[PDB]
Structure formats: structure tokens, C-alpha cells
A paper describes a structure:
We performed cryo-EM reconstructions of the Type III-A Cas10-Csm effector complex from S. epidermidis bound to an intact, cognate target RNA and identified two oligomeric states, a 276 kDa complex and a 318 kDa complex. 3.1 Å density for the well-ordered 276 kDa complex allowed construction of atomic models for the Csm2, Csm3, Csm4 and Csm5 subunits within the complex along with the crRNA and target RNA. (E) The smaller complex consists of a 37 nt crRNA, two copies of Csm2 and three copies of Csm3. An additional difference between the complexes is present: Csm2 is well ordered in the 276 kDa complex but, while present, poorly ordered in the 318 kDa complex. Csm3 mediated target RNA cleavage was inhibitied during the incubation by the presence of EDTA, which chelates divalent metal ions required for the cleavage reaction. Comparison of the 276 kDa complex to previously published Cas10-Csm complexes of the same stoichiometry determined by cryo-EM indicates that we have captured a state of Cas10-Csm poised for catalysis. Csm2 is present in two copies in the 276 kDa complex, contacting target RNA in the vicinity of positions +13 to +24. The D32 residue of the RNase loop, which has been shown to be critical for target cleavage, is visible in the structure but is not coordinating a divalent metal ion, as it is expected to, because of the EDTA treatment of our sample prior to structural analysis. The 5’ nt of crRNA, position -8, is gripped by SeCsm4 via pi-stacking with residues F40 and H291. The β3’-loop and α1 appear to work in unison gripping the crRNA in the vicinity of nucleotides +17 to +21 in the 276 kDa complex.
Type III CRISPR-Cas systems employ multiprotein effector complexes bound to small CRISPR RNAs (crRNAs) to detect foreign RNA transcripts and elicit a complex immune response that leads to the destruction of invading RNA and DNA. The S. epidermidis effector complex, known as Cas10-Csm, consists of a crRNA and five Cas proteins: Cas10, Csm2, Csm3, Csm4 and Csm5. Target RNA binding activates single-stranded DNA (ssDNA) cleavage and cyclic oligoadenylates (cOAs) synthesis activities of Cas10-Csm. Type III CRISPR systems also possess the ability to degrade foreign RNA complementary to the crRNA (target RNA) via the Csm3/Cmr4 protein, and many complexes also have the ability to degrade single-stranded (ss) DNA via the HD nuclease domain of Cas10, comprising a complex multi-faceted interference response.
Residue numbers in the entry:
A (entry chain G), F (entry chain E), G (entry chain F): 2 to 65, 74 to 214
B (entry chain C): 16 to 24, 37 to 136
C (entry chain B): 5 to 77, 91 to 303
D (entry chain H): 2 to 103, 111 to 335
E (entry chain D): 15 to 27, 37 to 136
RNA sequence: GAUGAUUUAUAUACUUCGGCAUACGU
RNA sequence: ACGAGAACACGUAUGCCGAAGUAUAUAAAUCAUCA
């Protein structure tokens, strides 16, 4: 058995917003905050959101029940099949490089986009303070892939390529239809952590 | 304790919505979690400050529209939230949270 | 004349026939065996046990009041002290007996299930052998007590022996967390008063039989219960292998006799290294 | 069916997407001789006023007002303290061009900026404008499944040299200049974003036709009524009202008009929409519409535009040309 | 808890705090909102000196609205805002600033109600 | 001949589970209850369990077909040995301080740990419930050592503490390999309750 | 008979979440809480979870039925082929350092990050609450390894090292494929608490 | 000739669901 | 010279699998106030 890492960095092109927890809803302040961390209060991108978006994109690319191609890569919890999710997608963490760059440039880690909704019968609007992580923010992901079958990995990664590439042509997080969460993936090194698999020929873009 | 008020009111608190009730419930859920974090019956001064902030939010949401105002006035929410601090016991706060939760659940029906 | 009171800090395994059943009391032969074995550990003299000591079966007490076995003169098993002044004469209502049975509970019987892994110690691929021990866990401040008779010096001897005994333990599974107790010496005026009664009958309090010459003139005008008493010789030096005690029949506590008998300490062992002294000295509380 | 489009917005009129950051008179210095405004950072200003202990006189310069308690701008204090202009770079954030219509600046609305303090067209705002055109065409806002497919991206960052400030002008009777200056993207600027349509629910030709019909009703029902008001004639002669009928015209940002963001003048006849919108604005704004006894020739009364003195021309707030190119 | 009585004591048939409209109150509170966001961004209880400078500039905003509008002036007076701002700067503790923010939002909470 | 009471206290380092069997057999209830008093219901450690664990640990220490030390300490009722145990392990009970402390801050005496077992053929998962004693619970051990021979205590306790040492580095109770039943010894007060033997120069921990 | 003790800390990269039991009928809070201690009411990482996870990864590293090395380290219940579990895993509690480090600057002990499951027919969203320990938390793992027969112990530890690596490359607890349960082992010292085995040369990292 | 001033401060939804609910050894 | 003595209810077992805090939503409307 073997297992490999895809260590990449997602740069935010258009501010990325993922909903948080119970936060502290202040009267005039932010209403829907980004999820953030707690040990350092820095923005993070949960791996669950990345996996959900990637799986939905791959399914819509293939499936149009479940889709077996998607099942092989994102788990197949059902009565009879049950195959382990090959991709253990991890939470994306606010890189130290972005921290030092934003501290040395007096740029806030997160934006604050005061949005609206007109309700165009009286044009009464609705203030709706919202923020998102600032463009150029880098989140490091360490994607973990499980080599369950030796003679499938390339095929899986083929889907991963689409599941990655079409993700770069797609949003993430909440309200992505309005220019939220546009991201690009950079420095996506591929390396093997367990086993003796040959991942040099592998490439993700 | 909460079924009669919910089912006594198409008609349900005139124009109340599930989203308003869950927006109210978010703060008390956070307080419930942070109370379960603490291992002592007595609530700290920080918890008292969070309870005061809860009252502030509750009053605001009552003020900005009539539906939640009537909902809170009918359910004796303000006297019970004041009694929570006055009694100053974790068990009574958990009972208040359970009462609010029962209100929300009966609102689902 | 003295009364010894016992509070058990652990459940007890006072068995009757098997490890799976445990009673709430140990008859006077078991208690005498405990006292004898403790005297042997202490290296003291045992002549007072064999010639000057009278003891009775263990009886329960429910935290303030003492019981004694029901005289045979329906569902009662132990009558409190303050009811013998009417029960022997025959003035206890059946409703009273039912109420006492409902209230009287000195403890609870627990069939604790255990395992033996000796077979796994050597044959690591073997399997555990489970068994059950029927213990009796006493209610708190509830426990055992018995009446012991003798001279003041014999009583001091017994007090020292029992000072060792409370850390020796009683009953079965003594080394396995059972039987340890703590004793005290207190006087109840009621116990003395019942001990000082007189009457034509004679109620018995310790499993007893007469000598081979006194047996004939003891059974006349008697209604009693007779029990089989057996067991295994608990002795390091009695034999190479564990040996079952020779079966001995005894009058159970609460019997009725027209004429009393002195009782005896019968050697119920075979030609072993040392004798085994089945206690049959009856204590009368008529 | 996935299809991506490069959409170019050419600003025929200045557009300002606000943020609610109505920054007051004490956070800028207007050089009346330079047609420029200098916007400062509050931290730098307060640190400067603490460095030489000028904060103490700042506090009693603000309270206990120096004569007029509303005209006390940033220029009056520095004049009192005789701090020259050539030393302001230590606390000024950035300088921009100002276009009045009247002389100081009253208040400067700050347009939307990201965390990097750069200028972009929000995806949500232009998507809302496009959806306003589409709903004008069809009146289906309840349908939440249609617009889950139309993805609009945030525009690329805009260079600081391309942005200016325009005063709000409300053409009701004449070219009245309002005490509202808003930070706007300059005219004749091409801003590119992405308009992806999924499942081919809306085709490019039909959305373009929806935009054109939106502007057709907008011009025919409300705008033309300003060609008879004298201020309207002056505004049109200055170039503020071009004959751009049957063309791809969108309205973006603040101060574009009630009609430019409401499908009300689209689903009803001009007259009926006029009375109903007059009732709506009477219900909402009692300051002006509550004091009007009779319905005017237009519901939003004054057309919202601006003027540029660098070319002595006028624009109206909102016009932008939208062009699509498939990729 | 100071804000409830002061709001209830200067509200009558309407008028709120001698002419303090909701819009002016939120204009005052926008700076408090942004400082609250910055404070929640920071993970250190001790306030950075830059944040102290922005706090004194919030006080400068308050003075400006007080000197430009009277109703804001007695809203800031009768609610004793400025002394609490002074305590917030002196204390150098984030929790005190958050407490002040909660107290300030209490004002609008009762103003709406 | 004398007696030496090794009293003291034992602290539950992590959840201790000693099975009883006949307490609950319902659907969704606890599948492995601890041994408790029938009516008192306070969890206890039987003296037989401690005796067996100590004997096993001492036999492992000595053997690596018997070593006379362990049988001397615990009993040798074989066909040709038949001995009386010099040490009488007693049942361990909650120290009253533990009871009152747990009652003050509403700490339950027992935990209800939930487990899975899954499967290597289908990975279908399968629930399990195991009752344990609450971490930090503290019990009393009253080990009575009867001095059969004088010139053995200065050795026996060295073995006994060894059996204690091995017991404080090893589980006590069921399912200890999957972390459980770790205990420690403390507050040991070796005393001579019967006889005139010096118990002030012996240590057990 | 020696007993090696692998003592150290485990740090959480992405919020570890090991589910509890039935808790209560909460209707919008603690939809799935993490297993917690009771004496301190602190988050706990049960040793059963580590043993099961390490068992699975080691058996799928060797076997991809019950593998011999995995059986010898973890346990081999069988009709007639039982050998003892030579590696008694142990529960993990918060370190002394972390318990005060997270309190001296007011860092939460657990997170309550939100979740979705939407749909593929109606997009009904259907949220979800998961409680995970805050990243950076240190849990004390005190694993114990019984030296049954000497001349394979090093090799066995080699195996556990490999298993440790897999834990350092995989998840622990629920939802770990969706970026959860990532940890590392550190501050690991190997010593013989009882016995005379020279475990100085033994190394785990 | 000066000056800005009001109104909304998030609204509507979903609030966990599906599966295994202990087995095998004495 | 204790129906007694010797005797761990013990061994294996991941609260685990799948699941996006997501959907919709223009920071907008008003143009007037004072000398």
C-alpha cells in the first residue's frame, strides 16, 4: 500500500467567503463572517468544502444514485460497494508567506465587501455587511491520495486533473456566482509519503 | 412548557419565520457550548457579559420588526433571561436553553 | 458471657455446598474453625477452645437490633431480640412475621462472575474458564454477631484471637477480597435478659450433637432440624492433597430439647497429621 | 454546457459602487487651486497630531466650534496652525481629481475597494444590473434556479490613475449641484469581467435584447420627459443625454436612479408606472415626495448626472456600454 | 447595563436624545464597527499602538460630530462616552474594548426598540 | 507471628473497565457494564482482579514450572504444594473524598465509551458500548500481609511493590490494550495492626 | 520482563473530531460532539481510536485474514491461535503546557465549524455541526509496549514507526477525509519504566 | 453663498441525513 | 485446622462511511436643508 501528497497553494483571485460558526454578530458589524481559524484567528478553507466542490464538479462532468468514477475518488458509502475515498482532501491553511506579505504591505488579511439586495419593487435595499479573504491570499493544501489499486492511479488523477483544472475555472465558498472564491492553484508539488509509488510522472494543473 | 404557546398562536406569531428563530437560536447555542466548555456551576463575569450581549441582540431583533417583538413578549423571554443572571446557576441557564430549543422545535411543527 | 459484633468491610462467601452459592451466616463450627486456625497462627494455647469455650452460630443485625434463629415450637428466618419474650410463649401474629420478613434485609446476594486465566498463562492459545462466586454484600452498619461464653481469661484469649481474626478474615475466598471484617464488644441488656431466662424447653444456638453415651437421653420430647455439615480440611499440613471432611450431622440452630446436653468437639478427620475439631457445644437461650 | 465570455464595460458615464463609507469633512484636504483632493489615513494624522502635541488644540478646535460648526474643514485647522502643504506627504494616503458642479467639497463617498485598497467592479453589482434587465424583460425574480447558472466574476484591479471624483447633480429644474461628491471610475474606460452561462438557459442574443428593451422603455417612458425642462435641455446640450436608443446600455452603481434599478417602468405603461412609482416614493420619502401635491412630469423628478470641467461636458450617472466576446 | 436607563430616560413623543436620528447613530458606530473587526482580527489582548491611535481618531470623530451636531453632543455627554473611551485607552486590554463596543451597540439596540 | 496492613489508595489514571456481565442486555444500552454493587451501584474493583493481575505480572517477572515467591504470596493449592496465601488482597472501594468531589461538580462515576469494529471485508462499521470508571477516580487497597515467617517480609514487599510497580505500568481490567484500566498507587501507609513487627521501614509504590 | 513506554505529545493539524455517544436531542447545537474527559471535562483522544486506526493502516500496509506483525502488536483473538497484545495503547489527555497556553491568551479548546450536504436534485443545503479540537492542541500519549520475547522488539518498534508515519499522513476520527484529524507525534522519548531492557537506542519519530 | 441629511444593518431556506445498532471465543 | 484452597469476566474491535455553510441577493434609494 502507498499514499501520496499533492502539496499546492491556492491563491484567491476574487475574495473567497466560507461561512463561519456562531461568531459574535455585532449590531453594525459583519453579519456573515468567514470561517477563520481559532489558534490564530486566521482565515482557513475547510477541506470539506474543497472536497464537496470538487466532487460536485467531477460528478456534473461525468454523471451529467451515485457516479462510480466520483465514488472511487470521494468515497462510496452505500449498502454493497463501500470503497475508501482515495482523496483525503485537507483543510487549506493561511500561509505564512501571505502573513508576512500582508504585514509588510499594510493590507488586511480579509476584505469587507458591503453587499446589498435591492428588491426592485421599492428599491429599499438591505445593507448586509459581508467580508471575504483578500485577493492574493495563499492557502496551503496537502491533499492526500490513497493508492488502493496500483493499476488505477493515473486514471484517478486524470479525473483529479479535471477536478483540479475545472475547479480553477470555477468558484468556491459561498456566493460564488457573484465573483466570490475564484482561485488558482500554484506550486502543486506531488510527492509520495507512504509506499514506493512513482509519482514523478504525475502532474496536476 | 413551550408547546401551548407555540400551538396557541396559517396563524403563527402573525408573521414569524424559521430564519428569525434560528438567528435568535445561534447566540444561545454558542452560549450553551461555551457553558459546556466550563466545568463550574458559577458563570464567570465574561459569561455575564455574553449574556448581556445576548439581551442586547434580543432587544435589537425585537425592535427592528414586529414579529419577533410579539414572539418575545408572548413567550416571557426577557424576564426569563433576566432571571438566568439573577439566579446565577449553570443548570438554570441550560434549562433556559432547553426551553428555547423546545420553542424552536414546536415552531418546526 | 460476652457478645461479639462484626461489621464486614467486604462481601463474604459463606458457602453451603458450592462456590456458586453463599449464605448470610456461618454456623458455630465455621467460626470455631476460624478461631482455631487463628490461635494456631498466633502460636497461643488452644486448650481453652477445646475445653472452656462456648460459642454460637453467627446471627444478623440490622444496624441496631440483633436477631436469633427462629425456634421450632412460617416465613421467618431470624427473629429480633425484642420478640422472643412473646414468640416462645406463642404471641406473634403472622402479619408481624410477614412485616419482619419484608423489613429484614442485612444485605444482598451477588453472583459475581469471574474468570480463570491459568490455562492462558502457559498455553497462551488456550481459553479463559469462567466461574461464579456467590457472595453476600452486607448493608452498612449491618452485619454479624454471636454469643460466646467462658471465663474472663478465656474471654481475653478469644479477644486476642479475634483481634488477629478481623484481619485474618472469615468464610471462603478470604484471600480474594472477601471475609475481612472489624469487631467490637458491646453489651445489650436484652441479650443478657434472654440469656438469663429459664424454661422447660431449651432452644439451641450452635450446631451440636451429644457424646456416644449422652445421645439416647437427648432426643426425648424434641422437635428440631438436623443438617448435613461437610467441607474440606483447610490446612497446609493435614495431607499432601486436599481432603474432604468426614460428613458430620448436627442439630441446626433454633432446635428444641426437653433436656439439655453438654455437646462435644468431635474429631471428624481421618488418620491425618492433625485432628479436625467439629464444634458441637450447644449454647442454650431458653 | 459550459461557456465563458469576456465582457467589456465602457463607461459612457461615471459609475460609483459605494460601500457606506461616507467619509466626512475632516478626512481630506481639497486644493481649490489644483482641482485635487488628498485623502489621508486617520492613524497617520492622529500620530502626527500627537508627535508635536497638536492633538490638544485639535480637540478644542473641533468642539467649541470656530464660528460655523459645519464649515470647519481640515483646511481651517492647518491654516490656524500654519502647517504648510509641502509637508503633508507624511500622512496623506493618496490624491485624486475632483469635478464639482458649482468652493470646497461637502462629503466624499468612497467607492468599493478590496483589502489591497484597489478598485474593482463587483461581480454582484453588475450581475444585479444584468438581472434587473432580464427581470424587466420577463418578471421572474421568484425563480432561484435560473440565476444559479449565471456566474459573474469580479473585475480586475483598476489603476489608481483612472479614477476620479464627481459631484452629484440633480437635473430637476436646472443643473443643481448637490452636496454629495462620489468617487467614480472615469469615463471612456474598458473594464473586463467574465459572464458564464450554464445549461444555456439564457442566450447572449436574448440577454442583449433584454438590455436593449430595458433601455428602450427607460428612454421612452421617463428620460424623454426631461427634454422639456430647461435644466434638462441644458443637460442634453452639454452632452449628458446621448441618443443611444437600441444599444447595449447598463446602469451600474450608486446614484443611477430609482427607475434605472427598478423594473417598475417596464412591466407597466408609462402613465400607470408613473402614478404607482409616485405612490411608492411618497410612501418611502416624506422629505420631498410627501410635500408634492401633484404628480410631476417624472417620478424621480431630478435626473442624476454629473459634469466635468476639464472638457466642459456633462454625463449622466449610470450609462455603460456592455459588449460580449465568447472564449 | 448603563445604556438602558439613559435611552429610556431621553425618549418621548417622536424624538430620541434631542434629535439623534438612527442614521447619525450608525454613522458614529461605523468606526466602532471597523475597530471591532480589527480587534477580532488581532489575537493579542494588548492593543497595538496603531490601534490606540485609531481609537483616539475615533474620539476625534466623536468630537467632530459633537461640534457639528448638538444632538450628538448630548448623546455623547449623557451616555458618558468619552470617559469610557479614556478608560479603554488607559486599560490596554482588548476585553475592555469589546465591552465598550457591546455597551455602544446597546444604545442602538434600545433605540430601535 | 504478626500482621502488616498495607493500606493506601489507587488512582485511576485512565478509564478502568472490569466486566460484570449481568447488568444490561438491551438494544442501544451498554454492551459491557462494569462490576458494581447490586444496590449501592458504586463501581468497585474486586480483590480477585487485583490479585490475579498482580500474580500474572509477578509470574511474568520471575519466570522470564513455577516460582515459589508468587505461590507463597498468593496461594499454591496444587496436588503437592497446598499453601496459604501470605497476602490478602481486599476489594477496592471509592474513597469518600472521591465520592464527595465527584458529587460536588456533578462528575459521573462512570463513562459510557462508544466504539466501532468495522470490517476488513465490507467496512460496514458496527457500534459498541463499553462502561468504564471515570478518569481520576480513586480507590482504597487494604492488602493484609500475614507474616508467616519473619525473615521474608524484607523480601516479600520488594516483590509486592514490584507487583505494584508492574501494576502501575500496566492495565487493570478488561480491554486495557485499547487504552483502559491504567492505575497508579499512592498514599501507601504500611502498618502493623497485629503483633510487634516494625512496619516503619518498608515502602510500597 | 520489561515494559517500554513511548511517551510524547500529539499535535492537531486539522481539527481532530472523535465522535461521542447519543448525548441529547439538541436541535441546532452540538450536532456531533467530540469525545471528552470527565474529571476535567477536557477533549480526550481515546487510545482505542489510536489502536483501531493503527491496526487498520498497518494491516492494509502489510496485507495490501489478519497479518502476523499486526496481530503480534495488537492482538490475535482466534479459536486456537491467540497471542497476547504486546502493545497496550493508552488514552491521550491535554498536556500541562497546552492547557495553560490556550488559557493565557484565550484560545478555545474546541471548534464548532459548520458543514453542508446540499443535494443533487433540489440543493436543500441541509447543514451540519461538527465539534473538533482546536489545532495546535497537544495530547499526551503514553503508549506501553510489553517486551514478551526480546529478539524482535526493535523490529516491532520499526513497525510501529511505520504505523506512526501513516497516522502522521492520515486522519484520526470522523470526517477525516474531509480535512480532519490530521496530527503529528513529537516530544517522544523511549524509556523502560519497569524492567532492565536497554531501550536507549530505540527511536520513534 | 454654504451644507449634506434620512431609510433599510442582512432577509428567505435547509438545522443533519443515509448505513452499521454489537459480534465472535470459553 | 472456615463447602474450603488455587482462579484478572478476560481476548480481538476506528463512533466510523458518504456528504460544499451552501442557494438566491446591484450599498442602493431619495433631493433637499440653511443665509
Amino acid at each position: 500500500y502507498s499514499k501520496i501528497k499533492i502539496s499546492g497553494t491556492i491563491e484567491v483571485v476574487t475574495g473567497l467567503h466560507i461561512g463561519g460558526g456562531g461568531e459574535s454578530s455585532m449590531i453594525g458589524a459583519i453579519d456573515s463572517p468567514v470561517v477563520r481559524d481559532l489558534q490564530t484567528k486566521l482565515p482557513i478553507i475547510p477541506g470539506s468544502s474543497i472536497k464537496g466542490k470538487m466532487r460536485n464538479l467531477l460528478a456534473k462532468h461525468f454523471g451529467l444514485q451515485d457516479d462510480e468514477r466520483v465514488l472511487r475518488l470521494f468515497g462510496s458509502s452505500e449498502k454493497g460497494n463501500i470503497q475508501r475515498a482515495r482523496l483525503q482532501i485537507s483543510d487549506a491553511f493561511f500561509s505564512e508567506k501571505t502573513k508576512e506579505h500582508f504585514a509588510q504591505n499594510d493590507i488586511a488579511y480579509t476584505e469587507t465587501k458591503f453587499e446589498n439586495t435591492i428588491n426592485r419593487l421599492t428599491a429599499v435595499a438591505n445593507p448586509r455587511q459581508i467580508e471575504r479573504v483578500t485577493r492574493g491570499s495563499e492557502f496551503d493544501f496537502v491533499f492526500i491520495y490513497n493508492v488502493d489499486e496500483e493499476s488505477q492511479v493515473e486514471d484517478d488523477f486524470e479525473n483529479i486533473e479535471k477536478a483540479i483544472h475545472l475547479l480553477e475555472n470555477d468558484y468556491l465558498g459561498g456566493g460564488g456566482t457573484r465573483g466570490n472564491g475564484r482561485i488558482q492553484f500554484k506550486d502543486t508539488n506531488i510527492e509520495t509519503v507512504v509506499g514506493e509509488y512513482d509519482s514523478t510522472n504525475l502532474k496536476i494543473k | 412548557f413551550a408547546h401551548e404557546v407555540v400551538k396557541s398562536n396559517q396563524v403563527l406569531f402573525n408573521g414569524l419565520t424559521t430564519s428569525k428563530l434560528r438567528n435568535l437560536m445561534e447566540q444561545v447555542n454558542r452560549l450553551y457550548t461555551i457553558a459546556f466548555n466550563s466545568n463550574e456551576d458559577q458563570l464567570n463575569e465574561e459569561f455575564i457579559d455574553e449574556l448581556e450581549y445576548l439581551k442586547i441582540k434580543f432587544y435589537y431583533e425585537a425592535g427592528r420588526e414586529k414579529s419577533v417583538d410579539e414572539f418575545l413578549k408572548k413567550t416571557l423571554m426577557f424576564p426569563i433571561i433576566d432571571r438566568v443572571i439573577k439566579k446565577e446557576s449553570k443548570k438554570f441557564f441550560l434549562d433556559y436553553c432547553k426551553y428555547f430549543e423546545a420553542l424552536v422545535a414546536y415552531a418546526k411543527y | 458471657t460476652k457478645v461479639f459484633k462484626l461489621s464486614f468491610k467486604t462481601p463474604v462467601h459463606f458457602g453451603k455446598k458450592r462456590l456458586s452459592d453463599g449464605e448470610m451466616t456461618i454456623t458455630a463450627d465455621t467460626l470455631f474453625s476460624a478461631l482455631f486456625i487463628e490461635t494456631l497462627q498466633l502460636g497461643k494455647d488452644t486448650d481453652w477452645l477445646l475445653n472452656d469455650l462456648i460459642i454460637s452460630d453467627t446471627f444478623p443485625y440490622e444496624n441496631e437490633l440483633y436477631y436469633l434463629p427462629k425456634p421450632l415450637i412460617k416465613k421467618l428466618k431470624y427473629v429480633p431480640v425484642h420478640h422472643y419474650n412473646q414468640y416462645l410463649n406463642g404471641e406473634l401474629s403472622a402479619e408481624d412475621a410477614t412485616d419482619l420478613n419484608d423489613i429484614f434485609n442485612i444485605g444482598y446476594f451477588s453472583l459475581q462472575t469471574k474468570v480463570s486465566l491459568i490455562a492462558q498463562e502457559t498455553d497462551s492459545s488456550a481459553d479463559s474458564e469462567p466461574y461464579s462466586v456467590g457472595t453476600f454484600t452486607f448493608e452498612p452498619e449491618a452485619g454479624l454477631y454471636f454469643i460466646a461464653k467462658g471465663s474472663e481469661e478465656t474471654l481475653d484469649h478469644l479477644n486476642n484471637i479475634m483481634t488477629a481474626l478481623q484481619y485474618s478474615g472469615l468464610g471462603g475466598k478470604r484471600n480474594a477480597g472477601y471475609g475481612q471484617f472489624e469487631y467490637e464488644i458491646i453489651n445489650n441488656q436484652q441479650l443478657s435478659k434472654l440469656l438469663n431466662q429459664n424454661g422447660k424447653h431449651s432452644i439451641l444456638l450452635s450446631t451440636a450433637m451429644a457424646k456416644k453415651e449422652e445421645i439416647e437421653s437427648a432426643l426425648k420430647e424434641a422437635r428440631y432440624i438436623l443438617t448435613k455439615r461437610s467441607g474440606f480440611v483447610q490446612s497446609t499440613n493435614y495431607s499432601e492433597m486436599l481432603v474432604k471432611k468426614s460428613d458430620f450431622y448436627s442439630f441446626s440452630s433454633g432446635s428444641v430439647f426437653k433436656n439439655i446436653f453438654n455437646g462435644d468437639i468431635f474429631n471428624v478427620g481421618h488418620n491425618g497429621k492433625h485432628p479436625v475439631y467439629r464444634y458441637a457445644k450447644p449454647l442454650w437461650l431458653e | 454546457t459550459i461557456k465563458n465570455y469576456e465582457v467589456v464595460i465602457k463607461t459612457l458615464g461615471p459609475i460609483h459602487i459605494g460601500s457606506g463609507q461616507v467619509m466626512k469633512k475632516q478626512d481630506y484636504i481639497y486644493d481649490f487651486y489644483n482641482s485635487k483632493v488628498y485623502m489621508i489615513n486617520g492613524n497617520k494624522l492622529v500620530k502626527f497630531l500627537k508627535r508635536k502635541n497638536l492633538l490638544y488644540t485639535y480637540q478644542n478646535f473641533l468642539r467649541y466650534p470656530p464660528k460655523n460648526p459645519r464649515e470647519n474643514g481640515l483646511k481651517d485647522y492647518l491654516d490656524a496652525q500654519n502647517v504648510k502643504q509641502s509637508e503633508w506627504e507624511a500622512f496623506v494616503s493618496y490624491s485624486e481629481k475632483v469635478n464639482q458642479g458649482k468652493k470646497p467639497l461637502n462629503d466624499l463617498h468612497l467607492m468599493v475597494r478590496d483589502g489591497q485598497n484597489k478598485v474593482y467592479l463587483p461581480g454582484s453589482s453588475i450581475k444585479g444590473a444584468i438581472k434587473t434587465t432580464l427581470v424587466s424583460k420577463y418578471n421572474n425574480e421568484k425563480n432561484k434556479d435560473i440565476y444559479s447558472k449565471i456566474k459573474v466574476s469580479d473585475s480586475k484591479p483598476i489603476d489608481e490613475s483612472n479614477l476620479a471624483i464627481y459631484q452629484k447633480i440633480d437635473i430637476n429644474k436646472s443643473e443643481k449641484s448637490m452636496p454629495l461628491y462620489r468617487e467614480c471610475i472615469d469615463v471612456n474606460t474598458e473594464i473586463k469581467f467574465k459572464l458564464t452561462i450554464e445549461d444555456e438557459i439564457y442566450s447572449i442574443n436574448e440577454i442583449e435584447q433584454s438590455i436593449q428593451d430595458f433601455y428602450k422603455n427607460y428612454y421612452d417612458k421617463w428620460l424623454v420627459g426631461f427634454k422639456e425642462t430647461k435644466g434638462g435641455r441644458r443637460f442634453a446640450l452639454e452632452g449628458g443625454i446621448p441618443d443611444v436608443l437600441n444599444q447595449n446600455i447598463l446602469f451600474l452603481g450608486a446614484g443611477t436612479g430609482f427607475v434605472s434599478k427598478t423594473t417598475h417602468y417596464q412591466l407597466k405603461n408609462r402613465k400607470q408606472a408613473k402614478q404607482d412609482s409616485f405612490e411608492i416614493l411618497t410612501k418611502k420619502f416624506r422629505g420631498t415626495y410627501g410635500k408634492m401635491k401633484e404628480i410631476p412630469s417624472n417620478v424621480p423628478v431630478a435626473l442624476k448626472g454629473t459634469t466635468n470641467q476639464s472638457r466642459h461636458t456633462s454625463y449622466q450617472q449610470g450609462m455603460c456600454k456592455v459588449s460580449f466576446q465568447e472564449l
